[PDB]
């Protein structure tokens with residue numbers, strides 16, 4: 207079979223899909239499956255992907271309902287023990303896939319690494335209940351999840367077009383999926399959405415973790431942890447809902463130590 211499966215969603219990615227695939231095919235010490243899920247690109251995207259044409263490259267090209275819909279197609283078709291997602295304008299760093307296989311050999315379900323964005327490290331958080339009241343704890347492209355992890359968590363929720371990665375990881379946390387965080391850069395993200403749109407999805411994700419929360423309550427927790435608002439009502443929300451979930455108590459204790 208394969209150690210790794212790399213799912214690459216693409217739509218009009220002729221500028222960079224080459225560099226993307228180069229960073230995957232040069233990975234040493236691993237048998238890797240590449241699944242390019244194209245959304246019906248009208249440009250030279252498909253012909254560039256076919257230029258490589260390795261025996262381990264599968265090309266899907268058809269209209270889809272978004273990045274996460276295309277991801278879901280690739281994940282379902284993956285045959286490698288560990289599955290990563292790489293944007294066509296991202297690149298893995300050298301030796302990353304071998305590190306993923308190394309950690310996967312010891313039984314870890316999720317292997318996540320650091321993320322380089324415009325020459326700076328992504329400000330990652332911890333894979334822990336506190337993440338449930340914030341965003342995705344690490345860069346999504348820096349994440350690798352085993353077949354078993356996906357079988358037990360499921361696919362990405364297409365109702366979330368921006369924060370579906372955070373919503374999947376929060377479910378992985380809620381599912382008690384093991385995670386190893388590697389303090390090394392896995393991915394170099396490419397920088398070339400309306401804030402309210404993201405804030406709306408983030409709050410909705412938080413409510414999906416803790417349905418007993420209203421919109422403003424989730425937003426107040428979001429703004430409180432993110433530093434955009436005051437944290438005077440944090441104690442009221444713990445008492446108001448503490449009895450509902452120990453996870454919610456744990457998430458608040460980790461996030462707001464005072």
Ligand SMILES: Nc1nc2c(ncn2[C@@H]2O[C@H](COP(=O)(O)O)[C@@H](O)[C@H]2O)c(=O)[nH]1
Nearest residue numbers: 215216217219243244245272273276293294
């Ligand atoms: N298959 C598919 N890929 C998409 C769609 N929209 C964006 N992508 C791809 O998903 C990745 C997103 O990276 P971005 O360019 O947004 O940083 C890129 O590889 C981009 O081409 C889509 O609707 N369908």
